[PDB]
Every structure is written in C-alpha cells, then in structure tokens.
Design an enzyme around this catalytic site. Structure first.
Site, short mmCIF file in Angstrom:
data_model
loop_
_atom_site.label_atom_id
_atom_site.label_comp_id
_atom_site.label_asym_id
_atom_site.label_seq_id
_atom_site.Cartn_x
_atom_site.Cartn_y
_atom_site.Cartn_z
N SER A 160 0.84 -1.21 0.00
CA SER A 160 0.00 0.00 0.00
C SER A 160 0.87 1.26 0.00
N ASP A 210 9.60 -5.74 -4.67
CA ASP A 210 8.61 -6.52 -3.88
C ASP A 210 8.95 -8.00 -3.97
N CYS A 264 -2.92 -5.59 1.82
CA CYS A 264 -4.34 -5.25 1.64
C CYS A 264 -4.88 -5.86 0.36
N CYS A 287 -7.52 -6.16 3.25
CA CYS A 287 -8.76 -5.40 3.05
C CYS A 287 -9.56 -5.87 1.83
N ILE A 288 -8.92 -6.07 0.67
CA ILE A 288 -9.66 -6.36 -0.56
C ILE A 288 -10.36 -7.72 -0.44
N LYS A 297 -10.85 -9.65 2.11
CA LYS A 297 -11.70 -9.85 3.33
C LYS A 297 -13.03 -9.10 3.10
N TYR A 321 -9.50 -7.53 15.11
CA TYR A 321 -10.50 -7.31 14.04
C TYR A 321 -10.40 -8.34 12.93
N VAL A 322 -9.20 -8.80 12.66
CA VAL A 322 -8.99 -9.83 11.62
C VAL A 322 -9.70 -11.12 12.08
N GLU A 367 -13.54 -10.50 11.89
CA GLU A 367 -14.03 -10.36 10.51
C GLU A 367 -14.08 -11.71 9.80
N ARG A 390 -8.78 -15.27 24.50
CA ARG A 390 -7.90 -15.40 25.70
C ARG A 390 -8.48 -14.50 26.80
N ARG A 399 -9.09 -5.58 21.72
CA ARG A 399 -8.29 -4.75 22.65
C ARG A 399 -7.81 -3.51 21.89
N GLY A 447 -1.82 -11.65 16.15
CA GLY A 447 -1.01 -10.46 15.90
C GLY A 447 -0.24 -10.60 14.62
N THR A 488 -4.35 0.95 5.39
CA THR A 488 -3.95 1.19 4.01
C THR A 488 -3.99 2.66 3.63
N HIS A 545 -33.08 11.82 5.11
CA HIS A 545 -34.06 10.78 5.50
C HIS A 545 -34.50 10.02 4.27
N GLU A 565 -28.40 9.73 9.59
CA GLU A 565 -29.10 10.91 10.12
C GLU A 565 -29.27 10.86 11.62
C1 LIG Z 1 -43.39 10.12 -2.88
C2 LIG Z 1 -42.63 11.01 -1.92
C3 LIG Z 1 -41.37 10.68 -1.49
C4 LIG Z 1 -40.66 11.49 -0.60
N1 LIG Z 1 -39.43 11.04 -0.18
C5 LIG Z 1 -38.78 11.78 0.73
C6 LIG Z 1 -37.54 11.37 1.21
O1 LIG Z 1 -37.02 10.27 0.90
N2 LIG Z 1 -36.93 12.16 2.13
C7 LIG Z 1 -37.46 13.34 2.58
O2 LIG Z 1 -36.82 13.98 3.47
N3 LIG Z 1 -38.61 13.76 2.12
C8 LIG Z 1 -39.25 13.02 1.24
N4 LIG Z 1 -40.47 13.43 0.81
C9 LIG Z 1 -41.01 14.73 1.31
C10 LIG Z 1 -41.69 14.60 2.64
O3 LIG Z 1 -42.73 13.59 2.53
C11 LIG Z 1 -42.29 15.92 3.06
O4 LIG Z 1 -41.27 16.92 2.98
C12 LIG Z 1 -42.89 15.90 4.45
O5 LIG Z 1 -43.87 14.84 4.58
C13 LIG Z 1 -43.58 17.20 4.71
O6 LIG Z 1 -44.06 17.20 6.05
P1 LIG Z 1 -45.20 18.25 6.45
O7 LIG Z 1 -45.33 18.15 7.90
O8 LIG Z 1 -44.98 19.56 5.77
O9 LIG Z 1 -46.50 17.67 5.76
P2 LIG Z 1 -47.21 16.23 5.59
O10 LIG Z 1 -46.29 15.16 6.06
O11 LIG Z 1 -47.74 16.21 4.21
O12 LIG Z 1 -48.36 16.23 6.67
C14 LIG Z 1 -49.49 17.14 6.53
C15 LIG Z 1 -50.69 16.46 7.17
O13 LIG Z 1 -51.78 17.39 7.42
C16 LIG Z 1 -52.95 16.84 6.89
N5 LIG Z 1 -53.89 17.88 6.62
C17 LIG Z 1 -53.94 18.68 5.51
N6 LIG Z 1 -54.91 19.58 5.56
C18 LIG Z 1 -55.47 19.39 6.83
C19 LIG Z 1 -56.53 20.01 7.51
N7 LIG Z 1 -57.18 21.10 7.07
N8 LIG Z 1 -56.78 19.59 8.78
C20 LIG Z 1 -56.14 18.54 9.25
N9 LIG Z 1 -55.13 17.87 8.69
C21 LIG Z 1 -54.87 18.32 7.47
C22 LIG Z 1 -52.49 16.04 5.69
O14 LIG Z 1 -53.49 15.19 5.16
C23 LIG Z 1 -51.29 15.33 6.31
O15 LIG Z 1 -51.63 14.17 7.06
C24 LIG Z 1 -41.23 12.66 -0.09
C25 LIG Z 1 -42.49 13.01 -0.57
C26 LIG Z 1 -43.20 12.20 -1.44
C27 LIG Z 1 -44.57 12.60 -1.87
C1 LIG Z 2 -6.55 -9.60 7.10
C2 LIG Z 2 -6.28 -8.12 7.05
C3 LIG Z 2 -7.30 -7.21 6.83
C4 LIG Z 2 -7.07 -5.84 6.76
N1 LIG Z 2 -8.13 -5.03 6.49
C5 LIG Z 2 -7.89 -3.72 6.35
C6 LIG Z 2 -8.94 -2.84 6.04
O1 LIG Z 2 -10.10 -3.23 5.79
N2 LIG Z 2 -8.63 -1.53 5.92
C7 LIG Z 2 -7.37 -1.02 6.11
O2 LIG Z 2 -7.20 0.22 5.93
N3 LIG Z 2 -6.39 -1.81 6.42
C8 LIG Z 2 -6.62 -3.10 6.54
N4 LIG Z 2 -5.58 -3.94 6.81
C9 LIG Z 2 -4.23 -3.35 7.02
C10 LIG Z 2 -3.50 -3.11 5.73
O3 LIG Z 2 -3.44 -4.35 5.00
C11 LIG Z 2 -2.11 -2.59 6.00
O4 LIG Z 2 -2.21 -1.47 6.89
C12 LIG Z 2 -1.35 -2.20 4.75
O5 LIG Z 2 -1.30 -3.30 3.81
C13 LIG Z 2 0.06 -1.85 5.12
O6 LIG Z 2 0.73 -1.40 3.95
P1 LIG Z 2 2.33 -1.39 3.95
O7 LIG Z 2 2.72 -0.70 2.73
O8 LIG Z 2 2.86 -0.97 5.28
O9 LIG Z 2 2.72 -2.92 3.85
P2 LIG Z 2 2.25 -4.20 2.99
O10 LIG Z 2 1.00 -3.88 2.24
O11 LIG Z 2 2.28 -5.34 3.93
O12 LIG Z 2 3.34 -4.34 1.85
C14 LIG Z 2 4.71 -4.69 2.20
C15 LIG Z 2 5.28 -5.45 1.02
O13 LIG Z 2 6.74 -5.55 1.08
C16 LIG Z 2 7.09 -6.89 0.90
N5 LIG Z 2 8.37 -7.14 1.47
C17 LIG Z 2 8.66 -7.39 2.79
N6 LIG Z 2 9.95 -7.55 3.01
C18 LIG Z 2 10.54 -7.29 1.78
C19 LIG Z 2 11.87 -7.28 1.33
N7 LIG Z 2 12.94 -7.40 2.14
N8 LIG Z 2 12.09 -6.93 0.04
C20 LIG Z 2 11.06 -6.78 -0.77
N9 LIG Z 2 9.77 -6.78 -0.47
C21 LIG Z 2 9.57 -7.07 0.82
C22 LIG Z 2 5.94 -7.68 1.51
O14 LIG Z 2 5.97 -9.06 1.19
C23 LIG Z 2 4.77 -6.90 0.91
O15 LIG Z 2 4.44 -7.28 -0.42
C24 LIG Z 2 -5.77 -5.33 6.90
C25 LIG Z 2 -4.75 -6.25 7.16
C26 LIG Z 2 -4.99 -7.61 7.21
C27 LIG Z 2 -3.84 -8.55 7.44
#
Ligand SMILES: Cc1cc2nc3c(=O)[nH]c(=O)nc-3n(C[C@H](O)[C@H](O)[C@H](O)COP(=O)(O)OP(=O)(O)OC[C@H]3O[C@@H](n4cnc5c(N)ncnc54)[C@H](O)[C@@H]3O)c2cc1C
Ligand SMILES: Cc1cc2nc3c(=O)[nH]c(=O)nc-3n(C[C@H](O)[C@H](O)[C@H](O)COP(=O)(O)OP(=O)(O)OC[C@H]3O[C@@H](n4cnc5c(N)ncnc54)[C@H](O)[C@@H]3O)c2cc1C
Ligand SMILES: Cc1ccc2c(=O)c(C(=O)O)c[nH]c2n1
Ligand SMILES: Cc1ccc2c(=O)c(C(=O)O)c[nH]c2n1
Ligand SMILES: [Cl-]
Ligand SMILES: [Cl-]
Ligand SMILES: [K+]
Ligand SMILES: [K+]
Ligand code: NA
Ligand code: NA
Lengths: 593, 593
Positions: free
Chosen positions: B112, B132, B149, B154-155, B157, B291-292, B295, B312, B317, B387, B437, B566, B571
């Site tokens: 890396s 290498d 990695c 990382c890749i 796993k 973690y290894v 995972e 152990r 830790r 380790g 990495t 939302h 959120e």
């Molecule tokens: C298909 C769709 C997808 C959406 N997806 C998302 C999303 O993923 N993320 C997001 O953040 N927003 C999303 N929105 C927007 C979100 O739904 C609205 O921003 C949010 O519901 C508005 O809240 P509000 O309190 O203004 O009104 P509303 O939630 O519309 O509530 C108003 C309420 O008052 C009632 N009411 C109306 N007139 C009267 C009355 N005179 N007396 C009594 N009750 C009355 C209504 O019937 C209703 O029950 C989506 C909207 C739609 C239509």
């Molecule tokens: C199972 C596992 C899962 C992990 N998952 C993640 C993760 O999800 N996210 C993350 O950020 N990190 C993760 N890590 C850590 C990450 O792999 C290391 O932090 C990173 O690879 C370290 O990079 P490096 O360059 O120090 O060494 P390395 O990537 O180990 O590269 C060192 C290289 O030098 C070579 N070498 C050694 N001695 C010599 C020599 N004398 N001459 C020539 N070449 C030599 C080695 O063989 C190797 O190819 C994981 C590690 C393991 C073991």
C-alpha cells in the site's frame, strides 16, 4: 436584546420556571411540580451569560429579582412559598390549567412537522391539540396518522427501493458463490405491499400512542383557521365545532397535482395510491421527471416491471443537470424506457381495475413529441408525478390575514411566523424552504422550543443535504455546479471529480466508470466546498457526514487532510485531484499506484 | 525557514524547475522538457507568500535571482538559454540522467505505502525502483504485487464479507416479496475464491502496468539495506547484486504471528492462506480476538460455516470496549460460537488436507479455560489471528544505524525520517502509527512530494477513522469513551447515544435496539466531539464524512445544526439528545413524535 427576549418568552410560555441549578428553593418547586405531574420549561439563569441581567428584568413582571419565579401563560404566579401555598391548598392544578383558550397550541396537520412540533411543545407543558385528516384520493385511498413521508412518501418509497435493490443482490449473490438461479425467481407485488403496509400501520399506531403518552389531544378532524385563535373542526360524523388556541402551527403539507387532460383523474393514479395499491401495477407509464417520478419508475423496473417515463423537457429540474443526466442514463441502461420531449393528451380506459382478482386495468395513452410524432401506447397503470401543491384555501379563511405567495405557500419570517403573529407555518407549506422530512421536524421542534421554553435557536435551511433514491442513488449537499458558476463566475469555480467503482461491483461484474463524485469549490475563498455530489450505492449514508463539514465551512484542504476508510466508496472524497479545467479524464482503473 | 527549506528542497529534488506562471522563458523550458519527455517538479514562485524571498535565496546556489532556474540532483544546471543549449546540442538527456546512484528512490516493499510512494516520486522525475518479494507462508502460499491489503487483507476480506452479507440479503428478499426459499440455497467456497482471486489478479497486473507506464523499475526481488545508499537484491534465481539509491523508503509491512505451541505452524493457517484457500475451511476455529479474527469468523459463519472463536481475554483490545462487546454479542446471536477465557495448548493432525478433491483435513485442538476445564474439540481448519510483526532483521543490516523500537518497528520523525537521514519508513513498520492502508498511501504520497517536489505538508495521523467489517459493522473516529475519560476525567465527558433500526430491517423482521451510536464529547471545550462510534450496516460509509468534520473540530452543536438526510442510518447522528449521565434508556421505538 435581553428585555425584548424576556417579554416574548414570558408572553408565550405555557408554564415556565426561572431557576438556578444550586438553589434549594428552586429544587422544592421542581419536586412539587414533578410530584403534581405538572410539565414546564425551566431556564437556569446560572447557565447564561446574561443571567444576571435576566434576573433584573424579571422584576418588570413579578416585582422580584430572586429565583425561583414561576409563570403561567404570561402571568407571574409565585416564588417558592407561593407555589407551595397553592399546592398545599389544592389550588395549584387550577392555576396551572387557567387559560383564555382551550389549548396553548393547536397544530393543524399530523405529519412530519406537526407531530414533531406538537410532541416537543407538550414537553414544556403546552396544552396541545394535533389535528390530522387525510382527504381521500380520487379513487378513495386514505391512510392513518403520520403524514406524507410515513404513509405515502419516504418510508414506503425507500422500502420499495430496497425491494428493488434486492434484485441486484440476488444477481450478485451468484458471482459471490451462492447457488441460486436469479432467472427462476419472481417478485410478488402484493406480498411486498402487505409488508410495507404492516410497517406503516405500526408507525400510525406508534404516533397515536406517543401523543397519548405526551398528553397531546389527537383529533382525526379537518381543521380550518377562521380567526387568529379559532379553529373550526369537522369530525368523521360531519360534526362541526370550534376549538381555541393561543399559538397555531399550520403544518398541512401538499398533495399531488394532476394535468388537465381527459382521463387523468379518472384512470391515472399518483404516489398517494401507489404505496397501498392492491393490484400489481403491471406495464407502467410514469408521467413526470421529478425525484418521485424517477424513484418510482426505478423500483417498479427492478421488481421486473415494463416501465416507461414520459419526460416533457429535462430530468430533475433544480438539481445539478450533469448528475441528473447520469441518474437517467443509469436507469435507461437498466431497464427503464424514456419517452423524451413528450407530453400526454388523453388517457382512454380499455379495462376497469379488477377488485376481486387484484389485477390492474388497461389504458390507452395518447400524447405527442416535440417533433410532431404521435405517442399512442397501452399501459396497465399510469402514474402522474407532475408536482405537488398546498391546498390552503381549504385550511384558512381568507379573512384571517395569513399571507400566501403566488404558489399558495405561506410567507414566513426566519422564525416561521406568518403575517398573523400567533400563527406559524412549518414544512412543505412554508414558502422557499426545502421540502424534506428532517427539515419539517427540525423546524417544528425548534419552533416549539422558542414558543414554550424561551429558546432563541432558528432552523438553518442552508446547505440541506438530499438523496434521490433512484436505482443508482444520488446524494448532494450544497450548490449544483451550474448554480455555483452563475453565482461566482466560471473563473472563481474549481471542480474536482472522479469516477469510482464500489468494491462490491468487482466480483459482481458491474460497471466501471459509472459511479461518480465531484466537489464544486470557490477558488477565491480557500477552495471552499460549495457543493458535494455523489452517484453511487448508499449515497445518503455517504453524503450525510459531509453535510456537517460543509455546514462548518469545509475547504478542499479539509477533505485532503482527512484519511480515507478503506475499502469504502466514500473514501474517494478524500483523494480527489483531477480538475474539470485540466480536461483530464475522471475515469479510474482498479489499481494504479 | 525559507533558506533551510530551499537548501533541503534543492538537495533532495531529482529534477526541479523554479518558475513563474506568467514567464514566457519558463514556458520555453517547460515545452522543451515536455517535448524531451523529461519529468520534473515545478515550483511557481508567483503562487507563494515567500516567493520573492525564495528568488533571493536561489542566488546562493545559482548566482542568479531570475526564473527559470533548473536543478538536477542538487546542482543548478541553467537558466532558459542554458537548458535550450543542452537540448539543441543533444546534451540535455545526459545531464538530466547524471546521478551518483542507480536510482533517486529505492522503495523496499511493493504494498500500500510503497507503490503509492514510488508512483508519486516518479511523477517528479525521480528515477525510482520498487522492490517486492512475498516470502511464502509455511504451507507455501504466495501472491503477486500490491501488498497485504490487495492480496491477503482489506480487498479479499471485504469481498468475502460481501459474500456473507448477501446471505442476509437472500433472507430479506423473501420478506420484500421475492419468491426464493433461502433454506434451499447453499454457498460454494471455491466459486467465491475464484472470483476474489480473479479480481486480485487484475490488481496485481494493474500495478505492474501502472509502474511500467510511470517508468518505475519493478524488481521482484528481496531487498536488504546494507549501507545508507546500497540495497542488496536477491532475485528468483538466487542471484545477488547491489543497486544504489539516493533516498530509500522502507515499506516492508508485517506478517502473521503464530503461537509457540505444537502443531500451530504445521497444521494451522493464517489470513495469508485463507484468502486463496483451495479447499472449503469447513468447521473452523479462529484463535484470536483482533478485528482480523472477528471479521474472518463472521464471514465464515455467514457462508454457512460452523465457527468458534477462542478468546484469551477480551475482544478488540484497543477499541472502545462497549462497542467491542456489542460487536461480539451480535456475532454470538448470529451463529458464531465463542470459547471465552480460553487458550490453545496443542494442535494434533487427524487428517491431511486433500489436494485433489479440495477438502480440508481434520485437527484436534487441545486447550484450557481459566477455570481449569479442558478444551478438546475437532476442527477442519484452525486460523491463528494472534497479531502481526515486522521482520526487519531480514530487511536491514544492523550496522546501517536505523533505530528500531522494542517491537522491531522503525522509530521515525513526524516526516517519516529514520535515524539514517536519507532513509524513511512508511506504513505498518512505522512505530506508533495506525496500521491502515489509506494511512500508508497518504504517508507515502506526501513523503514523495516532500522529497522530490519541495512540499512541506506532513501526514496527520490524528483522528484516523476505522471500520471493523464484522457481520454488523463498527465504524469509529477519535477516542474511545474509556480513553476520553482517562485523559480528561469523567466530569469533563458527556456521552450522547441512541439505538437505531435501519429502515431496511423493518419489513425484514430484524432486531430493534441493536444498532447503536454515540458521540463522546468534552464539556469544557464547547462539547467538542472527541470520538464518534457507530454499530450498523454500511458503517464505513456512515463514518467517513464525519471524519472531515472531526478533523475540523466539530462540536455537538455542529452535529445538531446539520439537517438529516431521511431515510438513512447516518441521520441519527444529527438528533442525538440522550446523555449517559441522565441514565435515560437509549432504546427507540419506530415513531414517537
Ligand atoms: C413520494 C414522496 C417521497 C418522498 N421522499 C422523501 C424522502 O425520501 N426524504 C425526505 O426527506 N422527504 C421526502 N419526501 C417529502 C416529505 O414527505 C415531506 O417533505 C414531508 O412529509 C412534509 O411534512 P409536512 O409536515 O410539511 O406535511 P405532511 O407530512 O404532508 O403532513 C401534513 C398532514 O396534514 C394533513 N392535513 C392537511 N390539511 C389538513 C386540515 N385542514 N386539517 C387537518 N389535517 C390536514 C395532511 O393530510 C397530512 O396528514 C417525499 C415526498 C413524497 C410525496
Ligand atoms: C486480514 C487483514 C485485513 C485488513 N483489512 C484492512 C482494512 O479493511 N482496511 C485497512 O485500511 N487496512 C486493513 N488492513 C491493514 C492493511 O493491509 C495494512 O495497513 C497495509 O497493507 C500496510 O501497507 P504497507 O505498505 O505498510 O505494507 P504491505 O502492504 O504489507 O506491503 C509490504 C510489502 O513488502 C514486501 N516485502 C517485505 N519484506 C521485503 C523485502 N525485504 N524486500 C522486498 N519486499 C519485501 C511484503 O511481502 C509486501 O508485499 C488489513 C490487514 C490484514 C492482514
Ligand atoms: C397501440 C394501440 C393503439 C390503439 C389502440 C385502440 O384504439 C384500442 C381500443 O380498444 O380502442 C386498444 N388498444 C390500442 N393500442
Ligand atoms: C472430541 C474429541 C476428543 C478426542 C479425540 C481423539 O483423541 C482423536 C484421535 O484420533 O486421536 C480423534 N477425535 C477426538 N475428538
Ligand atoms: Cl391512525
Ligand atoms: Cl504480480
Ligand atoms: K486524504
Ligand atoms: K439536526
Ligand atoms: Na492534506
Ligand atoms: Na441546532
């Protein structure tokens, strides 16, 4: 500002205690109120810069400068000895319930914003009523408490998106060594709808229990604001009465529009009907190009459906158009057909919906292209997604004085106040604000704290992140590239960009150089990130944390100094180096150096 | 600082041009160098605060204060007329290739960090060699270019984790309406390994092509640093030669440890063998709790395997122990068995691995619990994850003067320099640094820029985010709760926390109140976020963007003022309100208000 804040706070709070954390007299009152189950706001003056000044200002209402001071609905009710006198004489219940009005708060609308405002208000002892009514769709569809998102929006659409994503998961699982044959597996619409609707029912019920447990009055009644403090309610029996409230929150949301063409209302449906549809939509035409249109078209195609989207002009007007085109290209390359530069003229019925066998009907859609060619094709279902609108003439009497804009939305101050000073508007009806559930919730909860607990904090509507849950998701926070260029000029904009490939796509044999991200930055402001954009899986999860950094004024350098988490899609944001101005391709190979 | 920076820059740069963006003489030299395919660093003095001062300082090396100035390996070679004179007289190739050493840079280790350093160095005209060699495992496993990695980390796993996640995807797809029966589907190990290994082969090849395309010399040879500028190489033919280099980067990484018990080396395997294992592991014992360990245990169980983890003491830790326990609880409740407070004494062979039918062998593991009870159980495969260690006595002659710590890691300055001034160490062998990495890549790329392009920027090793890719993933950035409390005291720590439920888990009938997140904050520093922790799906995607905000000094208020996307898991970070000090339960219902 202290005396103006204290005047406003005292006038609006239902029940409030001015306190200090270390005062044993303050504790005796708190213990009495808790024992009597009297909810109230508390301001600990020992925890405020201007606490000393607020103490002095309090003598303008009470003639005293000591703590505790308890107020009810604008009136000083007592120090510790007075509150303990009312308690011992069984007078305190009557005093804390004394009001000119039935309620401290009436919320008209029981959706995202209204439920959040009402529950939060009740925490500070506001006597609260939430009104919700769901006017049926033209085919008669209705649903329970919770609003658009819960019942006919974000919740069901994201669940049906997950059903669609699971198609690709079945496909992928074969390459990852699982012994299933994707080609033999089918989807059952109604099984899915039953599961989604069972979840929605648990939310409808949960909200009713949450209101009952917060001592909020839930009325399933249509509310109409007839004067600043009077709400006319109409119940299911068509019984009409008036309830009164101090503060009024308008939270009534929007409903789908239909185009004015023959057969649209009679034979089409909207997203309001789709999420509970008792029959499988079958061959489907979606008319529209909003995020709702594309999200719905996308999951229907992934479920195995024959789907066409009829687009009048462009996709996702108002979103970054480069990203919109990539969203649509992915859809077109994954089983969604597009009828481009096309509008509908008429919907003709060929078959009525089968309500016993739960089968769709059949429709003939006639339309025309900009080139003059006719569109004429059969569909089982036609879904209009051609905008949403408020329907406030239903909701407020024109004589009350609440100003609406040319689109029928409520014109509000930066603290949600309408032109009627006790009346506020939150959520989708608040003109100019992002129409999103978490916006309505923050606005409603923060407003309730200002009205009933003397909070000052406003909702920040700037740089509100979004995600479009299309088959390949699109997350954004901040400006589109085109809006950044319009605002600051091309010479002040630098765009960093890259394709990427999810590791999960490698063994699955999915596309190189389709997922994409960019940062739109301002050169003259230390390469400030003006907009972040990502097309890829789990795009909402990717985008959300960057919203916090952008709110904080992140620059390109802040992204670069941060170390990636590997292997993730999001880490590509930490190593972007290719600029659009350079002309160098954003494509990437698996491993380079 | 300017004269010290210029001295260091000129001494180390292979080929560097001091320039201004607006100078036509500067353009004539750049166009000649580009035409001659001579790679070099460029410093545009008109783009630096201290550019005027650097111009003056340059006369200490060249006797001139004008641009352009071209340097090769510490020597001023000319102004524009001089560089165009060498070009026209076919002298310029010879001059830009003149070196005391075979290479400007020799990277020992092609992983890396090393590949990232070598490719980046080559961009600035450093003549670079990457060495290498993969010493085989005890059973003879080897692999190609790219490091731990890419080949055995990382890749693979994460790909095998995705294979495991797709089990739950098959389960979920039934609830979402898909007509497959999870109970009839099986996993084929070797099909999966073939796919993973084909991907890894594409990376091994990609790296070799990237080195060839950057004019980097790739030697598949074991390197030994025998003096500050001399590397002894041993090739596959056991041919021993010496190559010389100006700068040396040690990037040799680590390899698995084995416990000193009978049968461990002969009959067990490590993660180095697992990712290409030609037989299905079958009933598996993982000894270890890193973690290894977790995972690998986790994906093997999700593939349908009978898996036990022998612990152990504690899990993970060094990570937040509350989060570690939740990680392990999820595993135990989803098909991983734990042999707690248990250590191995002996591995006995019952069957030899079947190399024709690709079947595992069979082993008897004897161990003992802290309570004195014996452990004695049969397993088909035993994986040690106890380790990793550097093996630098292999890599550097003790006479060169590179200081190691008590763990055999290289003791480095904050700019990766060893005690030998031309010799640097990056990645897992650099003592005290997160063994990740993207850390090795940033360290190697930033170092190459300092050595060969006069960069000043250091790698920031603070608040480096992680993700543990257990069945339920765990993402973190910053301090554990316990480390925050140890550093600042309990009274200065506030912890906000919440359970959550992915929307995707609702219709799938998965657990309430298992996914969990918290923010560990410092009360006396404006509720600064010291640590962020999340247990849930896609946890790396959730955590990454918050790393940028934490690097910027995010507070609780920065999280609160940000609006959620939302519906997402992430959120929930934007609405946390329950403190540990309050004692209020972090559990959540579906919908409340
Ligand atoms: C298909 C769709 C997808 C959406 N997806 C998302 C999303 O993923 N993320 C997001 O953040 N927003 C999303 N929105 C927007 C979100 O739904 C609205 O921003 C949010 O519901 C508005 O809240 P509000 O309190 O203004 O009104 P509303 O939630 O519309 O509530 C108003 C309420 O008052 C009632 N009411 C109306 N007139 C009267 C009355 N005179 N007396 C009594 N009750 C009355 C209504 O019937 C209703 O029950 C989506 C909207 C739609 C239509
Ligand atoms: C199972 C596992 C899962 C992990 N998952 C993640 C993760 O999800 N996210 C993350 O950020 N990190 C993760 N890590 C850590 C990450 O792999 C290391 O932090 C990173 O690879 C370290 O990079 P490096 O360059 O120090 O060494 P390395 O990537 O180990 O590269 C060192 C290289 O030098 C070579 N070498 C050694 N001695 C010599 C020599 N004398 N001459 C020539 N070449 C030599 C080695 O063989 C190797 O190819 C994981 C590690 C393991 C073991
Ligand atoms: C493609 C196409 C074109 C026209 C018709 C039509 O007139 C009709 C009817 O019953 O009216 C049924 N189906 C049709 N399909
Ligand atoms: C659980 C258990 C306990 C002991 C043995 C044993 O001695 C043995 C052998 O072949 O030696 C095979 N299998 C065993 N299994
Ligand atoms: Cl209901
Ligand atoms: Cl190779
Ligand atoms: K970075
Ligand atoms: K928030
Ligand atoms: Na940086
Ligand atoms: Na806030």
């Amino acid at each position: 500002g202290t005396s103006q804040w204290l005047r406003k706070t005292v006038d609006s709070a239902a029940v409030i205690l001015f306190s200090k954390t270390t005062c044993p007299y303050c504790k005796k009152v708190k213990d009495v109120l808790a024992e009597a189950k009297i909810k109230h706001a508390t301001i600990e003056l020992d925890q405020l810069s201007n606490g000393s000044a607020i103490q002095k200002c309090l003598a303008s209402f009470s003639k005293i400068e000591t703590v505790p001071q308890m107020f009810v609905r604008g009136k000083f009710i007592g120090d510790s000895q007075t509150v303990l006198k009312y308690y011992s004489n069984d007078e305190l219940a009557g005093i804390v319930n004394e009001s000119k009005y039935d309620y401290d708060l009436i919320v008209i609308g029981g959706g995202s914003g209204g439920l959040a405002a009402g529950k939060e208000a009740a925490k500070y002892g506001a006597k609260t009523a939430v009104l919700d009514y769901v006017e049926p769709t033209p085919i008669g569809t209705t649903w329970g408490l919770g609003g658009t998102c819960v019942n006919v929006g974000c919740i069901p659409k994201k669940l049906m998106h997950q059903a669609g994503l699971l198609s690709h998961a079945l496909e992928d699982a074969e390459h990852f060594g699982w012994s299933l044959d994707r080609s033999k597996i089918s989807h059952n619409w109604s099984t899915m709808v039953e599961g989604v609707q069972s979840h929605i029912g648990s939310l409808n019920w949960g909200y009713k229990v949450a209101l009952r447990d917060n001592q909020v009055t839930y009325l399933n009644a249509k509310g109409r604001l007839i004067s600043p403090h009077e709400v006319q309610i109409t119940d299911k029996n068509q019984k009409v009465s008036t309830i009164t409230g101090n503060k009024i929150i308008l939270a009534t949301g929007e409903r789908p529009k239909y185009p004015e063409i023959p057969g649209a209302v009679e034979y089409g449906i909207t997203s309001d009907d789709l999420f509970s549809l008792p029959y499988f939509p079958g061959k489907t035409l979606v008319i529209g190009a909003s995020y709702v249109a594309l999200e719905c078209a996308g999951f229907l195609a992934s479920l195995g459906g024959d789907v066409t989207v009829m687009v009048r002009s462009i996709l996702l007007r108002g979103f970054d158009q480069q990203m919109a085109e990539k969203v649509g290209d992915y859809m077109e390359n994954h089983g969604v057909k597009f009828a481009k530069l096309c509008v509908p003229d008429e919907i003709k019925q060929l078959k009525v919906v089968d309500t016993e066998n739960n089968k769709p009907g059949l429709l003939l859609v006639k339309g025309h292209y900009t080139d003059g060619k006719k569109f004429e094709e059969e569909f089982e279902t036609v879904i209009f997604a051609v905008g949403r609108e408020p329907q406030l003439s239903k909701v407020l009497c024109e004589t009350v004085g609440v100003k609406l804009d040319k689109n029928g939305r409520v014109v509000c101050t930066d603290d949600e106040q309408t032109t009627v000073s006790n009346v506020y508007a939150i959520g989708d009806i608040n003109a100019g604000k992002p129409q999103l559930t978490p916006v309505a919730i923050q606005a409603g909860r923060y407003l309730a704290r200002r009205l009933f607990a003397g909070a000052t904090e406003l909702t920040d509507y700037s740089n509100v992140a979004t995600t479009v849950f299309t088959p390949l998701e699109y997350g954004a926070c901040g400006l589109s590239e085109e809006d950044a260029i319009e605002k600051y000029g091309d010479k002040d904009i630098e765009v960093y960009h890259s394709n990427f490939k999810p590791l999960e796509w490698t063994v699955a044999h999915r596309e190189d150089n389709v997922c994409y991200m960019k940062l739109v930055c301002r050169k003259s402001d230390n390469m400030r990130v003006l907009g972040l954009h990502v097309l890829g899986p789990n795009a909402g999860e990717i985008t959300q944390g960057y919203a916090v950094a952008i709110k904080m004024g992140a620059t390109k350098a802040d992204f670069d100094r941060t170390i990636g988490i590997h292997p993730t899609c999001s880490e590509t944001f930490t190593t972007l180096h290719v600029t659009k101005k350079s002309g160098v391709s954003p494509i990437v190979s698996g491993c380079c150096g």
